[PDB]
Design an enzyme around this catalytic site. Structure first.
Site, PDB file in Angstrom:
ATOM      1  N   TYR A   1      -8.335  -1.257  -0.623  1.00  0.00           N
ATOM      2  CA  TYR A   1      -9.190  -0.711   0.425  1.00  0.00           C
ATOM      3  C   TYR A   1     -10.550  -0.238  -0.067  1.00  0.00           C
ATOM      4  CZ  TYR A   1      -5.904  -0.997   4.308  1.00  0.00           C
ATOM      5  OH  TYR A   1      -5.092  -1.509   5.280  1.00  0.00           O
TER       6      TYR A   1
ATOM      7  N   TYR B   1       1.222  -7.059   0.141  1.00  0.00           N
ATOM      8  CA  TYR B   1      -0.229  -7.263  -0.017  1.00  0.00           C
ATOM      9  C   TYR B   1      -0.632  -8.658   0.415  1.00  0.00           C
ATOM     10  CZ  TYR B   1      -0.717  -3.081  -2.988  1.00  0.00           C
ATOM     11  OH  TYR B   1      -0.406  -1.873  -3.586  1.00  0.00           O
TER      12      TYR B   1
ATOM     13  N   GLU C   1      -0.108  -3.374   7.400  1.00  0.00           N
ATOM     14  CA  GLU C   1       0.216  -2.006   7.778  1.00  0.00           C
ATOM     15  C   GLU C   1       1.027  -1.882   9.104  1.00  0.00           C
ATOM     16  OE1 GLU C   1      -0.602  -0.267   5.315  1.00  0.00           O
ATOM     17  OE2 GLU C   1      -2.680  -0.465   4.695  1.00  0.00           O
TER      18      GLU C   1
END
Ligand SMILES: *[C@@H]1O[C@H](CO)[C@@H](O[C@@H]2O[C@H](CO)[C@@H](O[C@@H]3O[C@H](CO[C@H]4O[C@H](CO)[C@@H](O)[C@H](O)[C@@H]4O)[C@@H](O)[C@H](O)[C@@H]3O[C@@H]3OC[C@@H](O)[C@H](O)[C@H]3O)[C@H](O)[C@H]2NC(C)=O)[C@H](O[C@H]2O[C@@H](C)[C@H](O)[C@H](O)[C@H]2O)[C@H]1NC(C)=O
Length: 249
Positions: free
Chosen positions: A109, A70, A158
């Site tokens: 998100y 993260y 990602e």
């Protein structure tokens, strides 16, 4: 730190940035050869920094939690902006001396998305789009920020979780694109995928629960083995055991 400078960047230097970034993360041992990340780590080693400069030489330093890839905070010049609901540790060890501001939204998100009035399926990823978010993040403004942050984590966090995603943005180097449905689903699913590849040690390959994904074209399939094409050459970082199991997938 892991450097990437957009002013020299190609599909090659971008994969190497990702390749390097994948390899400053501590992991405890490779599950099915996908490195598994520490649930608990001496706070001296907790956070890694990515050193992002844009086409026009705006340098921002963004902080990554190695425990889950993260992004937790980012420094511009000498102000340092933290997500609402960070680690406490992050606040202590990170960006010492900078005026430290807490962004009004958590870093997840569905918050990001709200603050941006704009779901990431409408936000141009790409190597030009990275180098723009860096410009709108450097010169922070609470309107611009949240969509710039959407672009930053997908083209870095990602990308390092999923080689399918790394590959897509390696393609677009002088132009931008949009998340195709498959890139979204990998995104929304790294964790359930981590929980099941972790379990799938105990039943010799097979998932305990199935994981449902969507082809770029809208076809809902499911993966249910570490054999499957998603697990097999795609995934590159596994979510820490504690995080991945607490939630039921
Ligand atoms: C975070 O990431 C930053 C971005 O890369 C790092 O800062 C940059 O560091 C690079 C190299 O590591 C350094 O680049 C040099 O830039 C100079 C070009 O400008 C001059 O051009 C002519 C030359 O005569 C002059 O007449 C002009 O008036 C300009 O002043 C020059 O020294 C070199 O050629 C470098 O650029 C080349 O680019 C092409 C490559 O193929 C070559 O390999 C390379 O040599 C810049 O100083 C800097 N860039 C920007 C836009 O900010 C940062 O690390 C740096 O920190 C500074 C304190 C240190 O002195 C080093 O420059 C480097 O360690 C990196 N790390 C951290 C911790 O944040």
């Amino acid at each position: 730190d892991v450097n990437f400078d957009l002013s020299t960047a190609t599909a090659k230097t971008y994969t190497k940035f990702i390749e390097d970034f994948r390899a400053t993360l501590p992991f405890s041992h490779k599950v099915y050869d996908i490195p598994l990340l520490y649930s608990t780590i001496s706070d001296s080693r907790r956070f890694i920094l990515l050193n992002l400069t844009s086409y026009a030489y705006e340098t921002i330093s963004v902080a990554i939690d190695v425990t889950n890839v993260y992004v937790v905070a980012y420094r511009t010049r000498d102000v340092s902006y933290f997500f609402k609901e960070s680690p406490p540790e992050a606040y202590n060890i990170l960006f010492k001396g900078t005026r430290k501001i807490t962004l009004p939204y958590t870093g997840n998100y569905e918050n990001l998305q709200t603050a941006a009035h704009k779901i990431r399926e409408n936000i141009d990823l790409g190597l030009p789009a990275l180098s723009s978010a860096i410009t709108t993040l450097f010169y922070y403004n609470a309107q611009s920020a949240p969509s710039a942050l959407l672009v930053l984590i997908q083209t870095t966090a990602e990308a390092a979780r999923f080689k399918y995603i790394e590959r897509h943005v390696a393609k677009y180097v002088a132009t931008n694109f949009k998340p195709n449905l498959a890139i979204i689903s990998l995104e929304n699913q790294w964790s359930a995928l981590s929980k099941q590849i972790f379990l799938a040690q105990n039943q010799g390959g097979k998932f305990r629960n199935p994981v449902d994904l969507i082809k770029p074209t809208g076809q809902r399939f499911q993966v249910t083995n570490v054999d499957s094409d998603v697990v097999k050459g795609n995934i590159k970082l596994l979510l820490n055991s504690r995080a991945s199991t607490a939630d039921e997938n």
